[PDB]
Amino acid sequence: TNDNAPKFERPSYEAELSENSPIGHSVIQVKANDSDQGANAEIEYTFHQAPEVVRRLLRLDRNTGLITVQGPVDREDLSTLRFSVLAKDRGTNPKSARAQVVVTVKDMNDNAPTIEIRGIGDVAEETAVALVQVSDRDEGENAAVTCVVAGDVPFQLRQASEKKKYFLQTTTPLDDYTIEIVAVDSGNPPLSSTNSLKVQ
Ligand SMILES: [Ca+2]
Ligand SMILES: [Ca+2]
Ligand SMILES: [Ca+2]
Ligand SMILES: [Ca+2]
Numbered sequence: 466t467n468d469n470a471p472k473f474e475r476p477s478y479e480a481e482l483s484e485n486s487p488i489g490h491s492v493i494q495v496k497a498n499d500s501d502q503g504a505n506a507e508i509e510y511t512f513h514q515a516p517e518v519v520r521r522l523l524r525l526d527r528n529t530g531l532i533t534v535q536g537p538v539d540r541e542d543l544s545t546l547r548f549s550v551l552a553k554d555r556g557t558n559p560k561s562a563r564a565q566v567v568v569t570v571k572d573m574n575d576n577a578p579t580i581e582i583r584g585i586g587d588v589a590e591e592t593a594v595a596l597v598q599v600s601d602r603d604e605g606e607n608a609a610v611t612c613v614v615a616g617d618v619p620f621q622l623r624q625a626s627e628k629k630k631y632f633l634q635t636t637t638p639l640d641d642y643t644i645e646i647v648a649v650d651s652g653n654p655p656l657s658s659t660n661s662l663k664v665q
Contacts, residue, residue, distance in 0.1 A: 467556030469500040471508050473564035483571035484540035492523060495530035497552035497562055504555040515548040523568075525550065532566075540570040541602045572604040574652035580612065580660045582646065587638050594664055595633040597622060599648055607652035615645040615659070622646075633662075 473495065480493045499506035510530045512519065522536040523546070530550070546568040553561035578601040585593055601608035612631060614620055619639075622631040633644070642664045649657045 467501060467505040467554065467558050467560055469506075470560045471497040471499050471552045471554050471562040473497045473550075473552065473562060476564065478564060478566045480566070480568045481571055482534075482538060482546075482568050484538045484573050485575055486534045486538055488534055488536075490534040492532040492534060492568060493566070495532070495550050495552075495564060495566070497530070497564070499554050501554065501556075507555045508552050509555070511551050511553075512548055514551065518543060519546050519548040522546065538570055539575075540572045540604065541576065544570050546570065572607050574603055574607040574650055574654060574656060576602040576607070577656040577658045578608075578610040578612075578648040578650060580646050580648045580658060582633075582660050582662050584662075584665050586665060587640075588635065590635050590638045592635045592638075593632040594620065594635065595662060597631040597633050597646055597660075598628055599631070600628045601650060603650070603652065605652075607650055609651035611649045611651065613647050615647045618642060618644055620644055 482492050497508050509527050510525055512525050522538055523532050524535040525532050549563055549565045551563050553559045578599055581598045583596045599610050599612050601610050612622055619636040620633055621636055622633055624631055644662045646660045649655050
């Protein structure tokens, strides 16, 4: 008869996993142990109680305790996957044991900075003429954006001090102009977008 509980090799498991990992990719391996012999020591791993998301993104091998990728991890959609692995042997009285598991989703530079523009209408030098707002959905460096007017044109950007906002203003006056704004991450590889604009 079934004398022992299964026992995880660790009460709790931490893990890092970069978003957009390929399907099939190994995430982590869990192991439990039964001092017993026979079926009374034959462990199945299962997480039927795990959140829909976890079950949607991850596959847990019933026999080995290998968690591998089966869906699209988006750090931008969900940044941490926390759940619990159940291990029970095959006694007819099947003694169980439970280990909790945390996967922190690592950021990838998968998001090009976005730049939204609205106008304000001799004209004075240093005069604000548009509102430019810039935002990158990524994290840290991958969202450290650099924004500049492409060309040689008598306009430049100036920050509304410390979603980043900027005044597109005047560098000298006169008395009509197309103006291209350029945005670039400080992540590797960096991504980039532009937005044209006709002064009004
Ligand atoms: Ca047992
Ligand atoms: Ca993403
Ligand atoms: Ca990202
Ligand atoms: Ca980015």
